[PDB]
C-alpha cells in the first residue's frame, strides 16, 4: 500500500516534505499567554491534519481510525514540535518565532512551570543526542500511529511502524554509527516518547480544567474524556 513499498530514503523525503510550517503568534497575564497559545494551537491543528494525510499509510486507514489517532496524539505532536523548535534556544521554549518564553516568564497561569521544565528537559535531551530532522519527522509520525493503536483490522499500522523503525536505523547506519550504537540510539529516542506522552496527559489535564477555546480544540479535548 504505497507506504510499505517505499524505501527508507523515499520515506524520509516523504516526511520531510509533508512538514507543517512554523506559524506565528498574535508582559503577559494568565489569560494572555494562554489565549495566544490556544489561538496558535488551533491554527497548527489544521496544518497537522493535512500533515497526517501526507504521512505514508495514514490514508490507507478508515476515516474513523484517522480521527481516533489524531484525537489521541494531537497534543503530543504539538509538543514534540515545540521541543524541536526550542532545541537551539537552551532554557527557552520557542512557541513561535515571535513568541519566545523561558522559565520565569513561563508561569503566570497556575501550574505550567512543571510541564514547562519537562519540555525544557525534553529540549536538552535531543540537543545532547544531536537529534536530526530526519530522525525527528520519524519520531513524530510514530507518535501519530502509535499513541492510539492500542485504544481501538489486524494492521498494517504495526507494519508501517516497522518501516519507520527500519528507516530510523537506516539514518543511523548512514551516519556511521556502529551496530551497537544503532540499537542504543533507537532505544533512547523511543523512550522520549514515553515522556512526551506524559507531558501530553498533564497538559490535557490542565486544559480540561479551563480561555474561551475553539470548537475544534473542544472536540480534540472531549476525546480525552
Amino acid at each position: 500500500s504505497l507506504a510499505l513499498s517505499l524505501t527508507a530514503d523515499q520515506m524520509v523525503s516523504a516526511l520531510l516534505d509533508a512538514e507543517p510550517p512554523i506559524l506565528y503568534s498574535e508582559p503577559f497575564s494568565e489569560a494572555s499567554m494562554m489565549g495566544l497559545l490556544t489561538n496558535l494551537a488551533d491554527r497548527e491543528l489544521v496544518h497537522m491534519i493535512n500533515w497526517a494525510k501526507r504521512v505514508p499509510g495514514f490514508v490507507d486507514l478508515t476515516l474513523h481510525d484517522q480521527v481516533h489517532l489524531l484525537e489521541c496524539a494531537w497534543l503530543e505532536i504539538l509538543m514534540i514540535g515545540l521541543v524541536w523548535r526550542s532545541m537551539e534556544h537552551p532554557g527557552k521554549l520557542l512557541f513561535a518565532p515571535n513568541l519566545l518564553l523561558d522559565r520565569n516568564q513561563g508561569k503566570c497561569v497556575e501550574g505550567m512551570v512543571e510541564i514547562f521544565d519537562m519540555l525544557l528537559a525534553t529540549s536538552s535531551r535531543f540537543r545532547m543526542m544531536n537529534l536530526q530532522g530526519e530522525e525527528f519527522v520519524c519520531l513524530k509520525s510514530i507518535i501519530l500511529l502509535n499513541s492510539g493503536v492500542y485504544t481501538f483490522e489486524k494492521d498494517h499500522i504495526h507494519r508501517v511502524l516497522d518501516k519507520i523503525t527500519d528507516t530510523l536505523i537506516h539514518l543511523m547506519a548512514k551516519a556511521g554509527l556502529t551496530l551497537q550504537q544503532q540499537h542504543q540510539r533507537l532505544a533512547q529516542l523511543l523512550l522520549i516518547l514515553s515522556h512526551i506522552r506524559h507531558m501530553s496527559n498533564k497538559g490535557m489535564e490542565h486544559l480540561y480544567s479551563m480561555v474561551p477555546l475553539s470548537d475544534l480544540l473542544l472536540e480534540m479535548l472531549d476525546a480525552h474524556r
Binding site: 497526517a52 480521527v67 489524531l70 475544534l216
Partner: peptide
C-alpha cells in the same frame, strides 16, 4: 465532528 470535515477536504 469538525475533524471529519478537515480530514476529507
Amino acid at each position: 465532528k469538525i475533524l471529519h470535515r478537515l480530514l476529507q477536504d
